[PDB]
Point group: C4
């Protein structure tokens, strides 16, 4: 987890969302020293437990209500349970990663501080702050809008089937914990995306510095600069591995929830497109599909970019080697090339899979298969 | 995008098809200088927008017609919408790539000019022109024949179900924009195939030159020649990456359309083969299947050939190294071998997948699965 | 197969379970000399043959009984046959591997003795013994508890459908050979997991020793130590290959049984969750699912850990090379790096697949597909 | 295609089966000079055309017969057509490869002659002849037995449904061309397996020679021997590539036919196992399944063995390098290691897939999916 001054807003949003239980103090030199926050550690743990319990209690009550609005039939019961369960697993894994990653966070932030010192010439504090705040604000606004639309639509549906025997809106009111879990999931995804985008952006800055200093007496200084860049590349790879070791299970469960939500929402979208019951529900489901795809991209694109930027450094170094002739510089470039020959740049989700754009192809194949099966099933009955 | 004098006909065909909005002027030395064409940029943008709008307006009208000819049932509606949508996505992605690839096109053409200067001994202007014109002519003729057959068959079908209440041929007339989109797609695929085949052919020429000059005073000249060949190989790899970065989304959507069209056309072919309603429709669908498979090959084979020819250069260089003994030449060959050790030759479709013949195996597996599901569904009802 | 004094209990458990037909004698220096045990070889062979015959005889009798309890319908017959057959294949492959792996076991134990001599500073006899005995005890206790619960539940089911015409509990009594096969399978899996965990743990110890001796006159001794560590790494890779060559078919059939059991048990769990017949059966099936997943992890995690620990040694050696400057030590580190550049660390299940955590992703995909098909089938009828 | 004196019987069997249209003359030194045989080229071409035409004419007649025995229903018609078509595609591709591979065969045999000269110490003429003749004889005997059983079973089935209106045995008599195609397919598979096994066996002999000469004045001779072994390894890799380039399409269509036959035969086996109509048919179908799996192994195992033996040479060479110290020998071993670092050992089926044991896993997954779909389809109706 990256905790830096430009993107401290994301850190605070995660902290109040029970995902970053860390106490941070800004040093006199600007470095943000990090430590464990026992108060906020307990806050996160009990908030997660209470919210998960409330979510499942609401599910049970809706199932046991006089007239369930969402948990009505066996199929609807199973699908609602699956959706809530994937959200719960994602947020619980994120909270667990936040609780048990103080050392990884400390090491990652120290490495990032050293790297940023190395790449000081390319730092843009205002641009980084605005990008991070824009990502957080747009994600939170999108999830808030979608939660509001979903709550309104479900209240409308419940009132349509409402009977004088019992009030049905309280069933919807009991689904608020689920949407709070959605907010926590959005915060977790924003935090992970911020960290991964930071790593990829620093890889890109390192490549740009390499090209600008080696492709466009003092030979010793140039060799020192190349050694610093090689060390920064190695440290960025280690930072990618730190983020993987810290949030691989969280990313894995985020991907699982993305896949399940995409499949279920596409299935219901097709069902209602053939039925043509309510158009408002159709647009709401389309917005939900867009949001699920967008968060899948938010978790996949950063890792793909990081891997790509880490892997093109070897080509840059090969060009430098073919262009450089000085003995010390040539030896340093040879060492850097040998180091890059065996780097593992890709983000690994607990070793289950490699997180890059090929995951999008796998998800597309799985969604196509499941949708074919389910839709051709509903068509033949 | 390759824009060279031998294959300028393909460039003009793409330009009038809203895919290559570039103004080209032939220099006194034969080099084709390229620049942005604002007139043709606007022409391409508005032509694409208007044609897509007309296609979807025709779909809507047919759905809303007195007696739809194609958009009759929910299944037929969905399948027609899917087919038109994949075609629209493919052509729109191709047009977008054409609009936003002026710099990539310029760099690729400059690199190709330098490489052809290096490989001047193997250039065959007349053969290249005839191959390019033959590919363009055969592709355009095949799509024209298929469009004519499809229009005739659909007019026959509409007249068979025609009633005195309303005229049904106008529904078919409203599908002309869809076939114009098919023509644009054919032009886009021909252009991409021409560029990729050019890259693969230049890789093959480079390998042949290497073998002919190193396997079948002056040592300095030979080392210079080997350095030029190594630089040409590196530049050809960079050209493959340029084509990828410029048209990866277009290739991805072309592959998606190929997969969807193959699946749908095979499904309907099997359905009518069991029903045995009209044989003419059966042969038309078989021709459509052949055309879809042929364009899938046209997009897959060039990339596979380019990767293969790029990858066998390392074996050629290993043989040269085992055969060469001169100090300067040995060092140059060692440098070339080190460069080849870490080349990424494969074409990447936006990072989603690697475009080679294995995509054919993946498509075969997906088509087999989908066809099994759908056909066994229709058999059990 | 690893046969060491700390984990001799696992060896004895496997020996009495017809999986390790070896006679072992502890030398005066503590080394456990191993040889073929013809008495126990015959015991294992005839025990396996008799138990498999009894299992299939019980299946046949239950099918031919007056009122079958498990082999009642065609679907139930097929599923019970498939489950029993996967268990039989797994245990038979394990027994065959045990019978025909005396030379591999001898070589592996000799290599492990030499490696442990090299890594003597990190040996923990009591910890290894307690971990091995805990794994064996927990596995055997879990399988015993599950077998008891299954037998009780099936006796309850048989008595519920019991009629005065015939006694149905004898049908359950005829399924004891199947549960004995389950015990043999548990022993085989514990043995394989013990060996693979030993290899991975020794890889980790080697990496820790490397880091502690090279990252935190005498230069010759340090070079000798590095040479010994490199030889230990090579020998550990060869030991992984020995375990693969010896038990690849056993691991493959264990994975096949895990996949089939997970699919079938999840299918029945969903069926009874929708039916809601008996909750006790539901919890028993959930426990069975947990056990199948746990044994899948027990066979997958050790190989993944071994591969990971083998692969991070190259990064450690790269750091050492960048840190070391002495001529002899630098040359030794270069040799070690070259050796590590081409190591194949992964466990191969007879070449069919590479055993690591990606197998979990493949199993998840297959289970999801099969469950979607089967459950949507049962829903549409 | 390997054409050597020890395995000349396989060559003659292929030649009379229209697969090896080559004229061979044994030189005074034992080398089998090969050339094109125009008489046998024409014989092969017309035999293949006539047999395919007769097969499809028999299919058409059976479909159009008074009471079809095999092409009765739409499902049976489609399945019989698919089976015959996969067999026809396999044999036609094999014949085409035989016709258009004279140069590849010549180069492969010359390379094999040179390699066998290098590896003369490990040649076993009698063992090779007996292994080749045993493979050919067992394959031909198995296919003959299966064809006889199939013909007898189909005659029994036709006579059971026979009516006095028309004679039904002539329908079976019209299926003889299909079984002749089966014989041609068996010959093609035996030939390909013989060649691939030869390549793998020579790789193993090379590895054994390396180990026996480098792991268990004259230094110049030893370096010459190592250079000869390295050249033999490179030539064996080139021979694997020659076999791939010559018979990749044949192997691909053999694999496709294997997959289709396995799926269809398993489907019918399960259908009749649930129906329990005739046990003799059940055993015949089980034998057919065993034969299809055995020929899948016959095409997959040789390539896997060749790749494995080619890939372990690098480990052997690494050990030799760590053990050798002489300057000339050390340089030769370094050159050999560099050569092995970049070898592509695997057999490629026209680039569609890599032929090794993982193809068995892919086939198992595909068969499981298709069988699940089809069987659960038949169960729910």
């Amino acid at each position: 987890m990256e905790i830096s001054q430009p993107s401290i807003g994301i850190f605070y949003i995660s902290k109040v969302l029970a995902l970053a239980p860390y106490a941070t103090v800004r040093n006199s030199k600007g470095r943000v020293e990090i430590g464990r926050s026992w108060l906020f550690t307990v806050y996160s743990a009990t908030l997660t437990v209470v919210m998960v319990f409330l979510t499942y209690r609401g599910l049970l009550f809706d199932a046991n209500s006089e007239i369930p609005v969402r948990m009505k039939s066996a199929t609807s019961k199973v699908v609602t349970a699956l959706d809530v369960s994937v959200v719960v697993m994602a947020i619980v894994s994120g909270v667990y990663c936040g609780l048990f990653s103080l050392n990884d966070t400390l090491e990652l932030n120290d490495r990032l501080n050293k790297i940023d010192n190395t790449l000081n010439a390319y730092n843009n504090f205002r641009r980084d702050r605005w990008r991070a705040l824009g990502m957080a604000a747009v994600s939170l606004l999108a999830i808030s809008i979608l939660v509001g639309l979903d709550v309104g639509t479900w209240m409308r549906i419940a009132q349509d089937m409402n009977i004088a025997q019992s009030d049905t809106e309280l069933n919807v009111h009991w689904y608020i914990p689920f949407y709070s879990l959605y907010f926590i999931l959005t915060g977790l995804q924003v935090n992970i995306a911020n960290t991964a985008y930071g790593l990829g952006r620093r890889f890109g800055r390192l490549n740009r510095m390499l090209s600008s200093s080696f492709l466009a007496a003092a030979a010793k200084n140039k060799g020192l600069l190349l050694k610093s860049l090689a060390d920064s590349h190695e440290s960025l790879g280690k930072c990618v591995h730190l983020l993987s070791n810290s949030f691989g299970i969280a990313v894995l469960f985020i991907l699982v929830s993305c896949l399940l939500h995409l499949v279920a929402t596409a299935y219901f979208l097709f069902l209602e497109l053939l039925s043509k019951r309510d158009n408002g529900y159709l647009w709401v489901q389309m917005l939900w599909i867009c949001f699920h795809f967008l968060r899948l991209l938010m978790v996949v694109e950063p890792c793909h970019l990081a891997a790509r930027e880490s892997r093109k450094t070897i080509q840059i170094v090969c060009e430098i080697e073919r262009k450089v002739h000085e003995p010390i510089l040539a030896e340093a470039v040879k060492k850097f090339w040998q180091q890059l020959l065996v780097v593992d740049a890709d983000f690994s989700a607990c070793g289950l899979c490699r997180v890059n754009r090929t995951i999008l192809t796998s998800f597309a194949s799985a969604i196509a298969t499941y949708l074919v099966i389910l839709i051709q099933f509903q068509r033949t009955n």
